[PDB]
Design an enzyme around this catalytic site. Sequence first.
Site, short mmCIF file in Angstrom:
data_model
loop_
_atom_site.label_atom_id
_atom_site.label_comp_id
_atom_site.label_asym_id
_atom_site.label_seq_id
_atom_site.Cartn_x
_atom_site.Cartn_y
_atom_site.Cartn_z
N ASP A 39 6.73 -9.88 9.17
CA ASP A 39 8.49 -9.09 8.40
C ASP A 39 9.55 -10.10 8.81
O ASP A 39 9.85 -11.05 9.59
CB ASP A 39 8.38 -7.78 8.42
CG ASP A 39 9.24 -6.98 7.41
OD1 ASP A 39 8.17 -6.41 6.76
OD2 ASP A 39 10.27 -7.17 7.40
N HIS A 69 14.66 -4.12 7.80
CA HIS A 69 13.32 -4.08 6.95
C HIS A 69 12.32 -4.10 7.80
O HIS A 69 11.55 -3.05 7.91
CB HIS A 69 12.81 -5.03 5.66
CG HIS A 69 11.86 -4.90 4.85
ND1 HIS A 69 10.80 -5.22 5.09
CD2 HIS A 69 12.06 -4.49 3.70
CE1 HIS A 69 9.62 -4.84 4.27
NE2 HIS A 69 10.88 -4.10 3.12
N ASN A 161 6.10 -4.29 -5.70
CA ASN A 161 6.93 -3.25 -6.28
C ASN A 161 7.34 -3.34 -8.13
O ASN A 161 8.74 -3.80 -8.35
CB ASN A 161 8.33 -2.67 -5.47
CG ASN A 161 8.17 -2.00 -4.06
OD1 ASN A 161 7.18 -1.83 -3.70
ND2 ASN A 161 8.44 -2.29 -2.84
N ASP A 200 -6.91 -0.64 -2.54
CA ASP A 200 -7.97 -0.13 -1.95
C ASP A 200 -7.93 1.62 -1.48
O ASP A 200 -8.72 2.32 -1.78
CB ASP A 200 -8.25 -0.92 -0.36
CG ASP A 200 -8.86 -2.16 -0.76
OD1 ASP A 200 -10.20 -2.69 -1.02
OD2 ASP A 200 -7.76 -3.19 -1.00
N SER A 224 6.00 -1.29 0.59
CA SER A 224 6.70 -1.92 1.88
C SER A 224 5.98 -0.02 2.87
O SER A 224 5.61 -0.72 4.04
CB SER A 224 7.86 -2.62 1.81
OG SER A 224 7.82 -3.84 1.52
N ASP A 260 -6.68 13.30 -5.95
CA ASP A 260 -4.98 14.09 -5.92
C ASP A 260 -4.31 13.44 -6.81
O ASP A 260 -3.25 14.35 -6.63
CB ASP A 260 -5.32 14.25 -3.88
CG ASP A 260 -6.49 15.14 -3.75
OD1 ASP A 260 -7.86 15.23 -2.97
OD2 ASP A 260 -6.93 16.40 -4.87
#
Length: 279
Positions: A39, A69, A161, A200, A224, A260
């Site tokens: 990152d 970040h 995103n 997943d 992220s 859920d």
Amino acid sequence: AAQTNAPWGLARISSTSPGTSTYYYDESAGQGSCVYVIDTGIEASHPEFEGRAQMVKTYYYSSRDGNGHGTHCAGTVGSRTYGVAKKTQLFGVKVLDDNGSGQYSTIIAGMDFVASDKNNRNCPKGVVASLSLGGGYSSSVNSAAARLQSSGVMVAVAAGNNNADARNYSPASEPSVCTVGASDRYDRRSSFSNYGSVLDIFGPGTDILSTWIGGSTRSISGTSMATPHVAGLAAYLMTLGKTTAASACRYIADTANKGDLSNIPFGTVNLLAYNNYQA
Ligand SMILES: [Ca+2]
């Protein structure tokens, strides 16, 4: 162990139902594992990390996180207060500059770098790589993630995103790693989060309180922020002996809260990372 008035996402991955604020967990807390955050770096001096974080690579003129970040994601993995796996070793790999921009070929390099370096580290319980980054589709970027995974590192990647199908994004679409979509404190899919049969698992991604540089904290949003929750969870599970780096994405899916979330488009798993500690 119990940590009252916890950020909602830690409580959430230790709960079956939303709406509480304690994080219930086994005290081994990821001891003896390791997590590479790939990152903008990690402000290792942040006391939250308590001496358990080291930059070990950069592809830029400095190894410091001058963006925040990487520090935030790393805090969710393994900071004392805001982390999942509170006693894991953290390793930073700065592939993103400080505006948070990386060329693919630098991202590829840092990914092969983990497959090698893990061999320079002591990580008896397992090794994890947390990539809260992505963009368009690349065979090459995908192939680098599939090598990192194959080399016995549990690889956790942000689904992305844009609100889409993540099958057009990299490294998310790579099928053999663990692509993490996002949720909110009311169990909605976050309004951005990408979706698609390559995901997943979901973890907490919307209003995630974690570390930021200068020693500081902030609550930001993104897949992220969801990604290091599932990396830290896998470190936590290695360490408990439940699963292994090869097997952890499957184990987390098998043990998830199933049904859920609201708005799993059709065709996207409705699975919410869960530690199965309190029940
Ligand atoms: Ca997978």
